[PDB]
Design an enzyme around this catalytic site. Structure first.
Site, PDB file in Angstrom:
ATOM      1  N   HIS A   1      10.537   2.632 -15.354  1.00 36.60           N
ATOM      2  CA  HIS A   1       9.279   2.994 -15.978  1.00 36.60           C
ATOM      3  C   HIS A   1       9.173   4.483 -16.263  1.00 36.60           C
ATOM      4  CE1 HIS A   1       7.856  -1.096 -15.506  1.00 36.60           C
ATOM      5  NE2 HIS A   1       8.430  -1.080 -14.316  1.00 36.60           N
TER       6      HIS A   1
ATOM      7  N   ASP B   1      11.786   5.234  -6.946  1.00 34.50           N
ATOM      8  CA  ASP B   1      11.074   3.983  -7.162  1.00 34.50           C
ATOM      9  C   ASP B   1      10.606   3.831  -8.607  1.00 34.50           C
ATOM     10  OD1 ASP B   1       8.113   2.615  -7.119  1.00 34.50           O
ATOM     11  OD2 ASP B   1       9.437   1.648  -5.664  1.00 34.50           O
TER      12      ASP B   1
ATOM     13  N   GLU C   1      15.917   2.864  -8.737  1.00 37.14           N
ATOM     14  CA  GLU C   1      15.607   1.444  -8.829  1.00 37.14           C
ATOM     15  C   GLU C   1      15.382   1.082 -10.287  1.00 37.14           C
ATOM     16  OE1 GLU C   1      11.655   0.214  -8.311  1.00 37.14           O
ATOM     17  OE2 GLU C   1      12.135  -1.810  -7.662  1.00 37.14           O
TER      18      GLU C   1
ATOM     19  N   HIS D   1       4.265   6.858 -10.440  1.00 37.01           N
ATOM     20  CA  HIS D   1       2.816   6.695 -10.441  1.00 37.01           C
ATOM     21  C   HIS D   1       2.078   7.120  -9.183  1.00 37.01           C
ATOM     22  CE1 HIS D   1       4.934   3.166  -8.894  1.00 37.01           C
ATOM     23  NE2 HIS D   1       3.990   3.206  -7.971  1.00 37.01           N
TER      24      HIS D   1
ATOM     25  N   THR E   1       0.872  -1.169   0.000  1.00 35.31           N
ATOM     26  CA  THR E   1       0.000   0.000   0.000  1.00 35.31           C
ATOM     27  C   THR E   1       0.913   1.223   0.000  1.00 35.31           C
ATOM     28  OG1 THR E   1      -0.086   0.276   2.415  1.00 35.31           O
ATOM     29  CG2 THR E   1      -1.671  -1.237   1.432  1.00 35.31           C
ATOM     30  N   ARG E   2       2.097   1.078   0.583  1.00 37.10           N
ATOM     31  CA  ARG E   2       3.034   2.186   0.636  1.00 37.10           C
ATOM     32  C   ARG E   2       3.423   2.656  -0.760  1.00 37.10           C
ATOM     33  NH1 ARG E   2       5.051   2.134   5.896  1.00 37.10           N
ATOM     34  NH2 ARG E   2       5.915   4.227   5.531  1.00 37.10           N
TER      35      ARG E   2
HETATM   36 CA    CA Z   1       5.906   5.752 -16.436  1.00 37.23          CA
HETATM   37 CL    CL Z   2      15.855  -1.321  -4.175  1.00 37.04          CL
END
Ligand code: CA
Ligand code: CL
Ligand code: CL
Length: 448
Positions: free
Chosen positions: A178, A174, A200, A89, A48-49
């Protein structure tokens, strides 16, 4: 010298602050990576984090006041804080955040549907032949922010800059894979000063997007290290590690963040079963001893909890520091950063930081190895079923040293708490290491 940091997975702000003052600071840890401190969706699941609602400091780990207190207290103990930042996101679906904010239909307190990329699903094959879909479509249905937007960039930047003003010294980006590397560049242009930043990026090779593309915006997670180290320790020969690092195709050492495992691959995400975790006990100790002794990358010790076969479950219902009782090593928090061998490894790295070379490498062609860090320190690992009694050459001063993996030097440096290792007049050591054990010594843990 600070050289290692830790990830206190799901540790609340109170627990982190105390952990800094009582252990991390005194043991020499450089920093602590905390779980996302921004508002996120409700629910006990750990993930959820990773589904943001707003950037207000109201989360499972505590409120803003407690967050700030943790930053000040850790800083006072000499320990930095790295915030896990969600730059790719926002939460999926709809509901209420941990701060009371409502969201739904790609509508958030600080984002509208137009601030997101048109919805599409990232498919497995996309990783291999479609860069566009990987950075523009949704990761597990999460609203994919338009990181090319100046508004989005300003919003995320204001978040990062505000955290720096509070005292945060570093940030983990994070899901950086992407997000187009150029988008991250535009973002960093809005970031004040030059804080520690690691991105990451899971890249085992054969990807449309490569980790090397993020080398100009900050450090980058080298997931090959975790996988390769685990595979070698479980199914290969430690002797193969003589040229670990760039030699195995890894990114430059000065750009990499390494680790034995992380919260993701310790539960099947971005890593197979060959990854080594706390569940493997001594095997985990040895892998950690290698990583911490080997001069490659910026290592991050993992600190987890027993999830009891439930990869979705959140952390324990009790805190680490529970009314004078340390909830460690049992069925709640594992606190691997306190494991003698692991903490000892950190001490070793901290005292060998003046020589990042691998000297006098020796091995029995299989699962026995030994090498040093010049005259600063020496180590050896035995993973055979027979005792390692080989005599190895080192560049260390003759005398008696504490095996920092099993103990430490006293205040008056007149005694050790663990076994003693002797370096002969010719600089050699007559090893005596039982099966699945190890030793590590350094110039600042020598008996007087
Ligand atoms: Ca993206
Ligand atoms: Cl990581
Ligand atoms: Cl407290």
């Amino acid at each position: 010298t600070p050289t290692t940091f830790v990830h206190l997975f799901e540790w609340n702000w109170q627990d982190v602050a105390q952990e800094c003052e009582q252990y991390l600071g005194p043991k020499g840890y450089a920093a602590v990576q905390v779980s996302p401190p921004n508002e996120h969706i409700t629910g006990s699941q750990w993930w959820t984090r990773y589904q943001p609602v707003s950037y207000e400091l109201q989360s499972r780990g505590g409120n803003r006041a407690q967050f700030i207190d943790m930053v000040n207290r850790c800083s006072a103990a000499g320990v930095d804080i790295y915030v896990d930042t969600l730059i790719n996101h926002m939460a999926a679906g709809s509901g209420t955040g941990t701060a009371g904010n409502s969201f739904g239909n790609k509508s958030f307190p600080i984002y509208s549907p137009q601030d997101f990329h048109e919805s599409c699903t990232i498919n497995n094959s996309d990783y291999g032949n479609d860069r566009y879909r990987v950075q523009n479509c949704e990761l597990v249905g999460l609203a994919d922010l338009d990181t090319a937007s100046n508004y989005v960039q300003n919003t995320i930047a204001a978040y990062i800059n505000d955290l720096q003003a509070i005292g945060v010294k570093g940030f983990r980006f994070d899901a950086s894979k992407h997000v187009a590397a150029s988008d991250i560049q535009s973002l960093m242009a809005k970031v004040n000063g030059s804080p520690v930043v690691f991105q990451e990026v899971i890249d085992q090779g054969g990807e449309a997007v490569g980790a090397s593309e993020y080398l100009s915006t900050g450090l980058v997670t080298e997931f090959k290290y975790s996988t390769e180290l685990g595979n070698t320790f479980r199914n290969g020969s430690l002797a193969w590690l003589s040229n670990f690092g760039e030699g195995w195709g890894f990114m430059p050492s000065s750009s990499a963040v390494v680790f034995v495992d992380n919260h993701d691959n310790q539960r099947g995400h971005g890593g197979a079963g060959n990854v080594i975790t706390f569940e493997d006990g001594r095997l985990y100790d040895l892998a950690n001893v290698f990583m911490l002794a080997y001069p490659y990358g910026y290592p991050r010790v993992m600190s987890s909890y027993d999830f009891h076969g439930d990869t979705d479950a959140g952390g324990p219902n009790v805190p680490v520091h529970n009314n004078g009782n340390l909830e460690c090593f049992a069925s709640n928090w594992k606190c691997e950063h306190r494991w003698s061998y692991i903490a000892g490894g950190v001490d070793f790295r901290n005292n060998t930081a003046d020589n990042w070379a691998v000297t006098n490498w020796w091995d029995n062609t299989n699962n026995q190895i030994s090498f040093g860090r010049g005259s600063s320190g020496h180590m050896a690992i035995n993973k055979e079923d027979s005792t390692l009694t080989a005599t190895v050459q080192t560049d260390m001063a003759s005398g008696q040293y504490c095996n920092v993996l099993k103990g430490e030097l006293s205040a008056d440096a007149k005694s050790c708490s663990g076994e003693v290792i002797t370096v002969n007049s010719d600089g050699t050591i007559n090893l005596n290491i039982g099966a699945w054990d190890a030793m590590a010594i350094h110039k600042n843990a020598k008996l007087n």
